[PDB]
Amino acid sequence: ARDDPHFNFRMPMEVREKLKFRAEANGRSMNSELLQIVQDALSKPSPVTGYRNDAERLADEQSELV
Amino acid sequence: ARDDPHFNFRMPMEVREKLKFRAEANGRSMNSELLQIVQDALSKPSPVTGYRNDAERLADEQSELV
């Protein structure tokens, strides 16, 4: 669609229990929690801000593991 | 049998350009990359080495319930 695209995620049993618990366990609803952890995971700050860190690791261990 | 379940994820243009430019931009193919960061995202650390954290960053998990 090229402005808000759909794709199938679509995940092995423990990732979609871990990502959907992280949602239903904690308080986001995975198109919510997947987005707020994913916009978290590779775009980082909601403004507190005592936040500089290895989320520079899901960086260099997804992408120097790869 | 369901040991890999669907949803349609579904992302505003910035998250699917930043999840997919990561991916490369597109060689390791976001069902592939989204999984291999997401498996990185809710299931690292490695004790530094590299690395500890999303600390701080899944404290931005607290933020998005905060």
From Swiss-Prot, chains A, B:
Record bears the keyword Cytoplasm: no
Keywords assigned: DNA-binding, Repressor, Transcription, Transcription regulation
GO BP terms in the entry: regulation of DNA-templated transcription
An MF annotation (GO) of this entry: DNA binding
UniProt key word Cell inner membrane: no
Main function: Mnt acts as a transcriptional repressor of genes ant and arc.
Protein family membership: Belongs to the p22 arc/mnt family.
Subunit note: Binds DNA as a homotetramer.
Protein name stated in the entry: Regulatory protein mnt
Species the sequence originates in: Salmonella phage P22 (Bacteriophage P22)
Organism classification: Viruses, Duplodnaviria, Heunggongvirae, Uroviricota, Caudoviricetes
Encoding gene per record: mnt
Whole sequence portion shown: 2 to 67 of 83
